[PDB]
Curated annotation (Swiss-Prot), chain A:
UniProt PTM: Phosphorylated by CheA.
Required cofactor names: Mg(2+)
Name used for this protein in its record: Chemotaxis protein CheY
Localization terms from the record: Cytoplasm
Organism: Thermotoga maritima (strain ATCC 43589 / DSM 3109 / JCM 10099 / NBRC 100826 / MSB8)
GO molecular function ontology, one term from the record: metal ion binding
Gene3D superfamilies: 3.40.50.2300
Gene from which this protein is expressed: cheY
Curated annotation (Swiss-Prot), chain B:
Cellular localisation: Cytoplasm
Official protein name in the record: Chemotaxis protein CheA
TM region positions: none
Organism: Thermotoga maritima (strain ATCC 43589 / DSM 3109 / JCM 10099 / NBRC 100826 / MSB8)
Residues of the full protein shown: 175 to 260 of 671
Gene: cheA
Highest taxon of source: Bacteria
Function statement: Involved in the transmission of sensory signals from the chemoreceptors to the flagellar motors. CheA is autophosphorylated; it can transfer its phosphate group to either CheB or CheY.
Length: 118, 86
């Protein structure tokens, strides 16, 4: 019930999230570097929670959210954004995302987001 | 016999993307089928972040205090949610 699928292009960003997740009592189900891989990993890993980076519009994290929602209408997705992205975040929430966190990652915020989505 | 509640959402000083954080509150209220009657500041100002660390709402709710408070407490990154039946 604490398995997370981490989706982010940057290896360092995923590392920072893995560290927070582990220290917070959750576990890394797996990771993806893009949205296409995210949907594939969602089907195979069946994670409880997904963290989806949407900081890079070209990466199309929003489309991956919609695809994951189609695969599982009960999916629990936490969007990872940057400052100034309120419009994209609101759009992601309407697409099905449950909550959001903002970079750079603040452990206490990530921990509460994980706890609350559960 | 619906109910009307006064709600005050208080955010922490550093809270990022406050308009999106507040949107989550509006999204939760709509999920519970509540109707927002009035807000402080106006909806336009909220969407433009023309506020500090708190937002006030007056809503008509088909659910009671306990379920409403439980639902609003499920939102992360909120210092406090003040709810009073009116």
């Amino acid at each position: 019930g604490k398995r997370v699928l981490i989706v982010d292009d940057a290896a360092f960003m995923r590392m920072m999230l893995k560290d927070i997740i582990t220290k917070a009592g959750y576990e890394v189900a797996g990771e993806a570097t893009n949205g296409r891989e995210a949907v594939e990993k969602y089907k195979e890993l069946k994670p409880d929670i997904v963290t989806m980076d949407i900081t890079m519009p070209e990466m199309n994290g929003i489309d991956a959210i919609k695809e994951i929602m189609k695969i599982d209408p009960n999916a629990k997705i936490i969007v990872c954004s940057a400052m100034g992205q309120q419009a994209m975040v609101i759009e992601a929430i309407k697409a099905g995302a449950k909550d959001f966190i903002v970079k750079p990652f603040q452990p206490s915020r990530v921990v509460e987001a994980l706890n609350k989505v559960s | 016999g619906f109910k009307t509640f006064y709600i005050k959402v208080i955010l922490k000083e550093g809270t990022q993307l406050k308009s999106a954080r507040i949107y989550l509150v509006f999204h939760k209220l709509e999920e519970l089928k509540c109707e927002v009657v009035r807000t402080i500041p106006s909806v336009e100002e909220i969407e433009e972040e023309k506020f500090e660390n708190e937002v006030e709402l007056f809503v008509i709710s088909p659910v009671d205090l306990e379920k409403l408070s439980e639902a609003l407490s499920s939102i992360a990154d909120i210092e406090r949610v003040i709810i009073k039946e009116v």
